[PDB]
Amino acid sequence: GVSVITPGTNTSNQVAVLYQGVNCTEVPVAIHADQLTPTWRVYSTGSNV
Amino acid sequence: RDLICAQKFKGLTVLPPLLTDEMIAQYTSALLAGTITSGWTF
Secondary structure, three states, rough: EEEEOOOOOOOOOOEEEOOOOOOOOOOOOOOOHHHHHHOOOOOOOOOOO | OOOOOOHOOOHHOOOOOOOOOOHHHHHHHHHHHHHHOOOOOO
16 A cells, blocks of 8 residues: 655645555665556655655 | 465555554553552542
């Protein structure tokens, strides 16, 4: 599961993404290769982990 | 090596609770300390 953590669009458009139940040495890190689509999701980011 | 919790592959996962066992133990410890040292006043 993918969970999106937002403070509200009234406050800010920044979000935090929780990839539920998986490790993030294992999350796909195709950040600049998102247009090639190795993932079901299209969006990919490289923020603090 | 085969675990019964490999129901993830059929799409069935378990979410962890917000309060851990340590946090529930700290709440219980606070309740016990208040009950012993202050009665019903806390």
